[PDB]
Amino acid sequence: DVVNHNAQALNTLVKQLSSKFGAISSVLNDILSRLDPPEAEVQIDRLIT
Amino acid sequence: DVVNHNAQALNTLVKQLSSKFGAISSVLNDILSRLDPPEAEVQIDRLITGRLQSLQTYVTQQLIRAAEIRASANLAATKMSECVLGQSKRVDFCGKGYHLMSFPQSAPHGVVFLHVTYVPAQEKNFTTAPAICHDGKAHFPREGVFV
Amino acid sequence: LQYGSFCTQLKRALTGIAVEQDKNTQEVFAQVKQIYKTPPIKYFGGFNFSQILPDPSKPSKRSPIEDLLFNKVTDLICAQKFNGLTVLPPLLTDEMIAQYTSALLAGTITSGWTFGAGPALQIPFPMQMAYRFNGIGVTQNVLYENQKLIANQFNSAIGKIQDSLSSTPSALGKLQDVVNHNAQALNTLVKQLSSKFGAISSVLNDILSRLDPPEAEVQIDRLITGRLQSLQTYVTQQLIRAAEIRASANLAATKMSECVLGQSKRVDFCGKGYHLMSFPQSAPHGVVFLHVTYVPAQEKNFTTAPAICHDGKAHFPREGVFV
Amino acid sequence: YTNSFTRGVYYPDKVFRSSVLHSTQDLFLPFFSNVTWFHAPVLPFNDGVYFASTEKSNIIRGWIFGTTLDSKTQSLLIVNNATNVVIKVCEFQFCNDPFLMESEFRVYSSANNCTFEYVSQPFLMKNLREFVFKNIDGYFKIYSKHTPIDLPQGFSALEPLVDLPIGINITRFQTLLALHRAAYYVGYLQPRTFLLKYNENGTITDAVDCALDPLSETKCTLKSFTVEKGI
Amino acid sequence: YQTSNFRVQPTESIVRFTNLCPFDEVFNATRFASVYAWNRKRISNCVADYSVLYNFAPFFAFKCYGVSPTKLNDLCFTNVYADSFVIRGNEVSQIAPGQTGNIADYNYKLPDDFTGCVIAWNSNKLDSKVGGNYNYRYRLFRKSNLKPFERDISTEIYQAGNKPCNGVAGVNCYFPLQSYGFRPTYGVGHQPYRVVVLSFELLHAPATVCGPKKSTNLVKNKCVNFNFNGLTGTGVLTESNKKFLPFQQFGRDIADTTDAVRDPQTLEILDITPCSFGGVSVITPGTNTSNQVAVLYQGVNCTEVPNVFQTRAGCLIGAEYVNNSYECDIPIGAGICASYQQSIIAYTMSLGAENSVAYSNNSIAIPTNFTISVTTEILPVSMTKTSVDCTMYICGDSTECSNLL
Numbered sequence A: 001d002v003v004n005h006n007a008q009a010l011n012t013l014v015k016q017l018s019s020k021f022g023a024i025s026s027v028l029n030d031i032l033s034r035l036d037p038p039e040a041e042v043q044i045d046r047l048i049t
Numbered sequence B: 001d002v003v004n005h006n007a008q009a010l011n012t013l014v015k016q017l018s019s020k021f022g023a024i025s026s027v028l029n030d031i032l033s034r035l036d037p038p039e040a041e042v043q044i045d046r047l048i049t050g051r052l053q054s055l056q057t058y059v060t061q062q063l064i065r066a067a068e069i070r071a072s073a074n075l076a077a078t079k080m081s082e083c084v085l086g087q088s089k090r091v092d093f094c095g096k097g098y099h100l101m102s103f104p105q106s107a108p109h110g111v112v113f114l115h116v117t118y119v120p121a122q123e124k125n126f127t128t129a130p131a132i133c134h135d136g137k138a139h140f141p142r143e144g145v146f147v
Numbered sequence C: 001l002q003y004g005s006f007c008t009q010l011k012r013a014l015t016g017i018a019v020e021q022d023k024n025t026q027e028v029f030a031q032v033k034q035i036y037k038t039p040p041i042k043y044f045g046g047f048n049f050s051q052i053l054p055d056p057s058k059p060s061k062r063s064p065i066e067d068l069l070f071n072k073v074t075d076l077i078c079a080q081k082f083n084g085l086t087v088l089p090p091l092l093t094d095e096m097i098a099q100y101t102s103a104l105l106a107g108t109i110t111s112g113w114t115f116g117a118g119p120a121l122q123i124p125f126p127m128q129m130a131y132r133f134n135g136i137g138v139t140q141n142v143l144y145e146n147q148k149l150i151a152n153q154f155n156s157a158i159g160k161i162q163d164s165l166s167s168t169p170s171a172l173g174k175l176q177d178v179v180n181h182n183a184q185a186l187n188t189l190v191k192q193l194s195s196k197f198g199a200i201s202s203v204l205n206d207i208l209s210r211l212d213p214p215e216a217e218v219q220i221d222r223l224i225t226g227r228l229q230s231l232q233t234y235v236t237q238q239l240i241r242a243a244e245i246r247a248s249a250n251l252a253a254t255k256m257s258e259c260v261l262g263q264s265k266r267v268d269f270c271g272k273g274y275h276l277m278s279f280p281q282s283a284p285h286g287v288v289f290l291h292v293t294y295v296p297a298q299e300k301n302f303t304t305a306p307a308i309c310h311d312g313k314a315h316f317p318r319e320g321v322f323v
Numbered sequence D: 001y002t003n004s005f006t007r008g009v010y011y012p013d014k015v016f017r018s019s020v021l022h023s024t025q026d027l028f029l030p031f032f033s034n035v036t037w038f039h040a041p042v043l044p045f046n047d048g049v050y051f052a053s054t055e056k057s058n059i060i061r062g063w064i065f066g067t068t069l070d071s072k073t074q075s076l077l078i079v080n081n082a083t084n085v086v087i088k089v090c091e092f093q094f095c096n097d098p099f100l101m102e103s104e105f106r107v108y109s110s111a112n113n114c115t116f117e118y119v120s121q122p123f124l125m126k127n128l129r130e131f132v133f134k135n136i137d138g139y140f141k142i143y144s145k146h147t148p149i150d151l152p153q154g155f156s157a158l159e160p161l162v163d164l165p166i167g168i169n170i171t172r173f174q175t176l177l178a179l180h181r182a183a184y185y186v187g188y189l190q191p192r193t194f195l196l197k198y199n200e201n202g203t204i205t206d207a208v209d210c211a212l213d214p215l216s217e218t219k220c221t222l223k224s225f226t227v228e229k230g231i
Numbered sequence E: 001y002q003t004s005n006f007r008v009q010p011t012e013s014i015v016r017f018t019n020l021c022p023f024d025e026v027f028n029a030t031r032f033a034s035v036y037a038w039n040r041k042r043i044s045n046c047v048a049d050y051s052v053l054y055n056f057a058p059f060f061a062f063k064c065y066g067v068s069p070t071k072l073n074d075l076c077f078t079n080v081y082a083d084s085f086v087i088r089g090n091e092v093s094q095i096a097p098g099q100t101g102n103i104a105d106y107n108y109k110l111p112d113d114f115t116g117c118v119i120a121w122n123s124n125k126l127d128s129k130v131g132g133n134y135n136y137r138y139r140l141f142r143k144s145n146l147k148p149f150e151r152d153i154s155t156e157i158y159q160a161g162n163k164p165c166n167g168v169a170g171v172n173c174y175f176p177l178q179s180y181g182f183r184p185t186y187g188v189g190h191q192p193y194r195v196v197v198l199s200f201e202l203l204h205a206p207a208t209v210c211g212p213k214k215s216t217n218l219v220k221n222k223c224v225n226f227n228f229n230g231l232t233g234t235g236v237l238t239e240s241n242k243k244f245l246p247f248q249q250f251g252r253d254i255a256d257t258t259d260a261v262r263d264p265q266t267l268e269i270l271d272i273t274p275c276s277f278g279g280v281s282v283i284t285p286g287t288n289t290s291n292q293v294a295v296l297y298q299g300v301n302c303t304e305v306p307n308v309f310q311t312r313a314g315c316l317i318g319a320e321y322v323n324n325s326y327e328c329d330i331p332i333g334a335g336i337c338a339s340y341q342q343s344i345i346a347y348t349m350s351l352g353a354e355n356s357v358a359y360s361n362n363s364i365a366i367p368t369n370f371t372i373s374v375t376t377e378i379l380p381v382s383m384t385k386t387s388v389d390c391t392m393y394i395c396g397d398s399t400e401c402s403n404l405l
């Protein structure tokens, strides 16, 4: 389990990158395109937090 | 102290639900009624973040306390194996003095050890020597001391 | 005010850590009931303890080795003070700790292992050393017939310790690392106050004097959130580090009980070799043990047998070996 | 051609600091750089200019900064006449090879509206004169330093001298003396990150580039001028 | 017990800070440039009031972003810019930081991080010709988007198709610069407006444009609020021996906290130090035993507080020091403890009773009897086991927030 408990943990980390966290999308480029620079900042801050 | 700490933590967790976390109100239905669906989301998300953060802190503190309790339990098991099931020579491990025996008793969430030890008393002064010369030979005590 | 009760929890956690720190020191040093004193005449059969006994001339009343240790281990303070961070003094001063260690040394020199189990009973020091030789499996006459050689070896070995510490500067790395870790954490905390966290500025006065209250509130919120996060992180790291120091202090207390107040049969617990005795010394935020052990040398080859046959009977050695 | 060892360091901000290691990001002259030892043609103005000279008797007087150096486009001029600093910004038409009891003085081809004519105490006056010129944020900033002693291998920061809110665009520049082709160096500035040491007083005793070589990067990361054995 | 903090309070106010600064000629200008070529004027080195220009009251819209309009007279700025032009009221919404607009993209771009104020007043009578004023003209097309705070004057023929014209114009080639339809018949939104924006900076340079405030005399050695040139703060102001160079204005420690300042009126350097403060602890025996207390001011000199004993831990009030020595009862710190003996006393704790052993060359001590003793030891073994329902705790019974979760 010492092995397992590590291999599991990293997996969840790399999965949290696919979570929207209350933004329109989880993809930075997709948000950067479809929105104006003043608007994109709040979405980016949500993702960053 | 263990009971007091756990009760305090649970009470703090419960009381944290009545804090607004920078929203108009803490009651969900008030936000549901007082606002349109498009607007309610931000106000709701504030509460979500606050309550999630409080839960995370509670769990982390519990992990640290559990590690401390595990250390204590390992010490207790070692004392059970070495003071009760045997006779120890380690100084001050099983009571104060020369260890003779121990008796366990159960208590809520823990254990009590009764250590039975031997203590010298009523000492007296004597003159001593390292060895005895007799017939041109040096004599040493087999197990004791010359007085 | 309407952000929770986080301040109370943080204050309580820090208070608990602070109290645990004094309990740690009490466990290690306050192990003796009475304050023992050494006799005016310092003759112990040729053994010389001048390097570890208190020095009357110096005002601190510390032994030479303790002076070297204190010199070896070493305004930003005002900036931290001006932002609500304070450092509390420890309960036991350095003189009290040095007095405790001098009491332990006097007790073990004049009484053997007796003072740790009851009343202290006196015994001549070479006779105590003969008991300790019996403790590891050597007979008494080995000590009594080599007293001068053994005393000279002990004196030379004690003499080399001061040089060994003085030359090498990396010996005391553990004690220094503790201090550096604490100072680094405090420094990061105080330096974190200059982050915008998305606001227009990182000064409360500017935001207040520049905006109306309805627009100032949203700017205040960001700063509050960021600073609260920083405090929480700091407290969590302190809790973990204190959990580590407690384990170290428990180990030190056990070593004081078993190596100084007695003679230990556990292999490699009190030094390398067959344990004879140990002496404590105090250092800033820690303790230093000197372990005195016995090491065999100059071996030789022999032919051996398990038993001896005589008159149709088998003989076995009572406590030795046939060569 | 020659090498700028450790030169072109100035005070980035007008605030006091003492006994402190401070890290900044700014336009700078990278250490051990290729600089041109002119011994005499327009010279480009890219982001900034580091000028140094050791000439005596004030042979060199001033400089000309302009986007296109035509009467149609605004330009700059600076003159040091051993009496005062005559700065001007007016649309001039320049000679092909401009220069200066020579009772008569040369006149430029044309003049126009003069937007700013600051005048003050003259700049100039075995010794080295170093000047850093930068033009950003609608401001033209000038630094200077004069040191008694070939670029010597040492450290001497430059104190700010003036800032002009002219807010124009410059691309090219030249110097003002008899150019019938006097020894002066020219170097250029680039974005860099530096680590500066302030002593007990306000002086900058030493500095370190953060991208010269891996050892310098280590010195940056550790934030010290000494490194112990390790990885 | 630790209860609260103590803080010294300020007793006064100190402020430090001439020719008037003209705006009327800027606002009351005979003619205003076009939108595509917008006039810009630099304002500096003059004290100005924003209320006198707020007395004319021709304005229709006031929008301050970085600052609040009410506090404008209270702030000191540097490098003031005023950008002025004329445009009809139809496009007023197009001028805002990070705002999409035809003139915003193609005539005058405002950065989204703008710090300043935008105002516009309707001088319809003065600026609308009855026969049509086509002098004001705006660019309509260009190959690329305009950068913020950039003015473009070159108006070439714009190719609007495959057809190469090169001064031919016609179809697929329209000249960008086009004039307004200035009809007095045209209603609100199509009548002229004189629009000016004011751009400032905050704290990157020493102050030049200060508002209408009056300075006072300075004080020393007293905790007092100070407002040096807009630098607000609180503390004791002391003389300074810092070697400030003539261009240097402030100072700063390792923690980036202001440590000195120069008076705007008198050129001299002053140090700053916040007034004293600290924590407060209350020492009490049991409530049932008595009701007296003692108070400890942690890390504070006794001279700075409104029996008094000084300790390396702080100032102690309400306890009498004694020369005896006992075992510790209530730990104060640094070797000092406190106890109750119809009064509260403080003393230095004692390590223990003193004993001397009779060491000798040939003397031994042997026990002649013994004692059997029993001792207790208590060890916790387990904890309480708890479980939680995440969704029910966070969200309760609302299904809306479950999806958010």
Ligand SMILES: *[C@@H]1O[C@H](CO)[C@@H](O)[C@H](O)[C@H]1NC(C)=O
Pocket: B123, B124, B125, E358, E365
């Ligand atoms: C042994 O003799 C010394 C000599 O003064 C005395 O102090 C000590 O009390 C004696 N021991 C006992 C147990 O009486």
Ligand SMILES: *[C@@H]1O[C@H](CO)[C@@H](O)[C@H](O)[C@H]1NC(C)=O
Pocket: C299, C300, C301
């Ligand atoms: C014992 O004998 C062996 C073989 O003769 C030799 O290798 C070894 O060194 C000897 N031991 C000693 C202590 O001389």
Ligand SMILES: *[C@@H]1O[C@H](CO)[C@@H](O)[C@H](O)[C@H]1NC(C)=O
Pocket: D001, D002, D003, D034
């Ligand atoms: C500087 O540049 C010139 C031309 O690019 C070159 O010849 C010279 O070697 C360079 N100096 C160096 C590399 O030190």
Ligand SMILES: *[C@@H]1O[C@H](CO)[C@@H](O)[C@H](O)[C@H]1NC(C)=O
Pocket: D199, D200, D201, D203
């Ligand atoms: C810094 O100033 C002090 C002021 O007395 C002076 O003694 C010292 O030499 C100065 N150090 C320099 C200029 O490096």
Ligand SMILES: *[C@@H]1O[C@H](CO)[C@@H](O)[C@H](O)[C@H]1NC(C)=O
Pocket: E301, E302, E303
């Ligand atoms: C501050 O306390 C010290 C002793 O700690 C004392 O000598 C001094 O007079 C006190 N007051 C001042 C102003 O330093």
Ligand SMILES: *[C@@H]1O[C@H](CO)[C@@H](O)[C@H](O)[C@H]1NC(C)=O
Pocket: C041, C043, E360, E361
């Ligand atoms: C023990 O013997 C030594 C040398 O024989 C002597 O110097 C010392 O005084 C003696 N201790 C006594 C008499 O207590």
